[PDB]
């Protein structure tokens, strides 16, 4: 579900790259970029927390 995003962001960027004067396309690209960033930060922050549990597991082997 993260690659569809990677796709929609590239797709939105392509449409804008070809018609940079359209504000609806600049709004769509901005919106999908932050959706992408939000999602990715959610993933990396969630992995870091699980790593905390992993650390606790390991040092209590």
Swiss-Prot record:
The effect annotated for residue 40 to L is: Non-invasive phenotype
Task: From the record, give the cysteines joined by S-S bonds.
Answer: none
User: Which keywords annotate this record?
Assistant: Protein transport, Secreted, Transport, Virulence
- Result after altering residue 40 to A: Exhibits constitutive secretion of substrates. Retains the ability to display SipD/SctA at the tip of the needle filament
Q: What is the effect of changing residue 13 to A?
A: Exhibits constitutive secretion of substrates. Does not display SipD/SctA at the tip of the needle filament. Is non-invasive. Can polymerize into filaments in vitro
Effect on the protein of changing residue 37 to A:
Exhibits constitutive secretion of substrates. Retains the ability to display SipD/SctA at the tip of the needle filament
Q: Outcome of mutating residue 59 to E, per the record?
A: Can secrete only early substrates
What does the UniProt entry list as the effect of changing residue 8 to A?
Non-invasive phenotype
Q: Name one GO biological process term.
A: protein secretion by the type III secretion system
Q: The organism sits in which domain of life?
A: Bacteria
> Consequence of mutating residue 52 to L?
Shows a specific deficiency in the secretion of the translocase SipB/SctE. Retains the ability to assemble needle complexes, but is not able to invade cultured epithelial cells
Question: What is expression of this protein induced or repressed by?
Answer: Negatively regulated by PhoP-PhoQ.
Q: Where in the cell is it found?
A: Secreted; Cell surface
Phenotype upon gene inactivation:
The null mutant strain is non-invasive.
Record's GO cellular component, any one? extracellular region
GO MF annotation list: identical protein binding
Q: What is known of its domains?
A: Deletion of the last five residues prevents self-association and yields monomeric proteins that allow biophysical studies. Forms a right-handed helical assembly with roughly 11 subunits per two turns. The location of the negatively charged surfaces are radically different among the needle filament proteins PrgI, BsaL and MxiH. In PrgI, the major negatively charged surface is not on the 'face' but instead is on the 'side' of the two-helix bundle, and only residues from helix alpha1 contribute to this negative region.
The family this protein is said to belong to:
Belongs to the SctF family.
Instruction: Please state what the protein is called.
Output: SPI-1 type 3 secretion system needle filament protein
Tell me the gene name: sctF1
Query: What range of the intact protein is shown?
Result: 19 to 79 of 80
